[PDB]
Design an enzyme around this catalytic site. Structure first.
Site, PDB file in Angstrom:
ATOM      1  N   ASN A   1       0.840  -1.190   0.000  1.00  0.00           N
ATOM      2  CA  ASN A   1       0.000   0.000   0.000  1.00  0.00           C
ATOM      3  C   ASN A   1       0.879   1.246   0.000  1.00  0.00           C
ATOM      4  OD1 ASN A   1      -2.707   1.058   0.003  1.00  0.00           O
ATOM      5  ND2 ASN A   1      -2.411   1.684   2.143  1.00  0.00           N
TER       6      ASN A   1
ATOM      7  N   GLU B   1       1.578  -2.610  -5.322  1.00  0.00           N
ATOM      8  CA  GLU B   1       1.194  -1.248  -4.961  1.00  0.00           C
ATOM      9  C   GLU B   1       2.375  -0.402  -4.506  1.00  0.00           C
ATOM     10  OE1 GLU B   1      -2.136  -0.384  -2.559  1.00  0.00           O
ATOM     11  OE2 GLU B   1      -3.539  -1.665  -3.651  1.00  0.00           O
TER      12      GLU B   1
ATOM     13  N   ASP C   1      -1.560  -9.930  -5.121  1.00  0.00           N
ATOM     14  CA  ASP C   1      -2.889  -9.519  -4.718  1.00  0.00           C
ATOM     15  C   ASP C   1      -3.869  -9.808  -5.843  1.00  0.00           C
ATOM     16  OD1 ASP C   1      -5.168  -8.312  -3.821  1.00  0.00           O
ATOM     17  OD2 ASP C   1      -4.325  -6.284  -3.758  1.00  0.00           O
TER      18      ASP C   1
ATOM     19  N   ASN D   1      -6.963 -10.022  -5.554  1.00  0.00           N
ATOM     20  CA  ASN D   1      -8.195  -9.271  -5.308  1.00  0.00           C
ATOM     21  C   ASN D   1      -9.458 -10.107  -5.445  1.00  0.00           C
ATOM     22  OD1 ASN D   1      -7.234  -5.914  -6.250  1.00  0.00           O
ATOM     23  ND2 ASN D   1      -7.990  -6.672  -4.278  1.00  0.00           N
TER      24      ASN D   1
ATOM     25  N   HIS E   1      -2.598  -4.489   3.935  1.00  0.00           N
ATOM     26  CA  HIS E   1      -2.341  -5.906   3.681  1.00  0.00           C
ATOM     27  C   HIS E   1      -1.275  -6.426   4.636  1.00  0.00           C
ATOM     28  CE1 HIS E   1      -4.488  -6.431  -0.245  1.00  0.00           C
ATOM     29  NE2 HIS E   1      -4.366  -5.115  -0.248  1.00  0.00           N
TER      30      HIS E   1
END
Length: 256
Positions: free
Chosen positions: A10, A36, A149, A151, A247
């Site tokens: 993130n 990210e 990720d 998702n 995360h």
DNA sequence: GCTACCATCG
DNA sequence: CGATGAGTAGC
């Protein structure tokens, strides 16, 4: 032992501010895949590209402070692939692949669809374009780990509030069915679920309400592994002793 | 400010 | 159940 860590940070600069750089070393990880970056190459310090003298390869988004992935590794990859091969998606920096002998590790950031219907469209197209890539990868006959990720949560055990999210991006029937296709049709192994049948292993928590403290989470971060290598995995854990990101890093050890 | 990424309440 | 109502990183 071969220790591989997948972590959506993130924002890598933020994560480094929250002690992720020290974690890279303390973990004793051989390979660290991150998603990210929320940064472009010009915005990264050398320690964010080659942390602790590790080799590093990244794919950054064209828009600033957005997306981006990377693979860090103590060992020098003999080959590196930047991007999937589709401009539409590669514009956002979501795929890096590194080869190490017969082993390949991918850092993958699959598009989120919770923002707008258009984004869910993009996500679906991504699924369509990526499935065959997973098929071919599976067909190489090498040891491949796809970290990142995705998702998407697979079954009810993969998120606390499973009933109320059946209509939200991340747990839509078609998504779940796509993951199931990747596993049971293509033959990829969901390493966590296979190592630990009944352990939820959430890897993400929304900033809404008191989700984190309440452990209202989702398992949307995976290591997807080819059969031979999957068979060698010995343990895994979700690191929560420190919080670097919304995360949590997913750590798997393979008896390679 | 802006953009981009579902827990909780009635 | 549908309706309501967000905290974060980086610009």
């Amino acid at each position: 032992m071969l220790k591989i860590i997948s972590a959506n940070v993130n924002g890598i600069r933020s994560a480094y501010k929250k002690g992720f750089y020290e974690y890279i070393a303390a973990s004793g990880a051989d390979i660290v895949c991150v998603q990210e970056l929320k940064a472009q190459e010009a915005d990264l310090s050398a320690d964010m590209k080659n942390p602790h003298g590790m080799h590093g390869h990244w794919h950054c988004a064209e828009k600033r402070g957005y997306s981006g992935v990377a693979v860090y590794s103590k060992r020098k990859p003999d080959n590196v692939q930047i991007g999937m091969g589709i401009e539409e998606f590669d514009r956002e920096g979501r795929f890096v692949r590194c080869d190490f002998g017969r082993l390949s590790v991918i850092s993958l950031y699959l598009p989120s669809g919770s923002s707008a219907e258009e984004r869910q469209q993009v996500k679906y197209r991504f699924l369509d374009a990526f499935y065959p890539m997973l098929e071919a990868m599976k067909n190489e006959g090498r040891d491949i780990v796809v970290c990142g990720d995705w998702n998407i949560a697979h079954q009810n055990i993969d998120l606390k509030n499973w009933k109320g999210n059946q209509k939200n991006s991340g747990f839509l029937p078609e998504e779940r069915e796509w993951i199931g296709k990747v596993i049971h049709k293509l033959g990829w192994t969901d390493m966590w679920r296979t190592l630990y049948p009944d352990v939820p292993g959430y890897t993400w928590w929304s900033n809404r309400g008191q989700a984190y403290a309440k452990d209202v989470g989702w398992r949307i971060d995976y290591q997807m592994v080819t059969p031979e290598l999957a068979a060698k995995a010995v343990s895994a854990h979700v690191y929560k002793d420190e919080k670097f990101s919304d995360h949590a890093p997913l750590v798997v050890e393979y008896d390679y």
